[PDB]
Amino acid sequence: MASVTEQFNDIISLYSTKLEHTSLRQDSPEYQGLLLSTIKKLLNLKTAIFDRLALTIDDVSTASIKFLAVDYYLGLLISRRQSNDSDVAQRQSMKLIYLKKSVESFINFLTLLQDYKLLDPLVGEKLGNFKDRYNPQLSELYAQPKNNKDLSGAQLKRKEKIELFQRNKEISTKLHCLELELELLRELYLMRLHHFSLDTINNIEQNLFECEMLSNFLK
């Protein structure tokens, strides 16, 4: 519906202008209220595009390429949800559900790019390391030091992080020069997905760590 592109564009704008960063309290009903309706809209859009219109990357028309990011944006929005339930257990437990759902969306997104043979092999190696795609482990994303003496383990982790970081910076700069230069459109859209897939690894790490940390306090 309406068009799908305009709808997507409005969603992304709400995200960038009001939901990515806020000056309001994140537990505020004004913030969560807009966040929730945004998500509801994006979920409706996914159904419209993927289910009802039912849309190789050669096969995708230029303006449709944007939509491969719907799960990315669901990832980003969902990780930001918070409950205001008076019940403290319920509100904390809900947070874990949000982080779980955010990560699932993020994984949907990578899996989709992989299905289109678009996935940076750096990102794909990480995606592949999940023994259970639906139960992904922070221990599968990077090598982790065995203990607090494991210098090699820690140096290996730093090596893998630095490689993520450099690659992310590289694609960010390529995306940046493309946006500013704005035939190029198609390249921009593809580069944008590229930057998203790298960003995703950071979000998946942060959410898995954050989830594990907040979970211990409920145990």
Place this chain on the structure above:
Amino acid sequence: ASVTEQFNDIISLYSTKLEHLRQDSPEYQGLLLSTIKKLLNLKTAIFDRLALFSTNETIDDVSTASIKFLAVDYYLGLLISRRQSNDSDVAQRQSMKLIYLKKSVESFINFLTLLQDYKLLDPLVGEKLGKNNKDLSGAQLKRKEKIELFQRNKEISTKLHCLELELKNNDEDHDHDELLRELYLMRLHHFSLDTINNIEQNLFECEMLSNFLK
């Protein structure tokens, strides 16, 4: 019975049953509490009664067999770290945990101060001694992967390892008292790193808990 025998038993209890199965259990928390109580009473005896470290002005005035007592505050930090409420109410548990972590930090800092008093505190440790849940978790993550910590732990562990072997390796039947003492003091150096570590972990957890309220 004596101050020194009470200490070895407290430490042995910790190492065997309290350091690492079932932590929410009344049985574990019961044993943790009695051990903390014993250790606080031993603290009163050595620190206040005997005044061991207020009356021996220099580290060399402390006997080798009494160097071990410097770690009292260290073990109190550790024990207190592991205290948990088993109340059905989540908010009570979490607030009770906040309190414990705050009290474990106090002991740990007490331990470093005491090492500082004896001019034994490592210069790096010394300068360490003297935001929502997403940002805290983010910050923790990056701190936890800093190299300096692992490099330093590796070093001290190998120094420790070699000191123990130099102590044991003794076909000549020499007096290895100077080495024994070096071992003990190095072990406190180790503890001091683990303390800075634990203090950060606790402060992070304590800040996370505090967020849940504001």
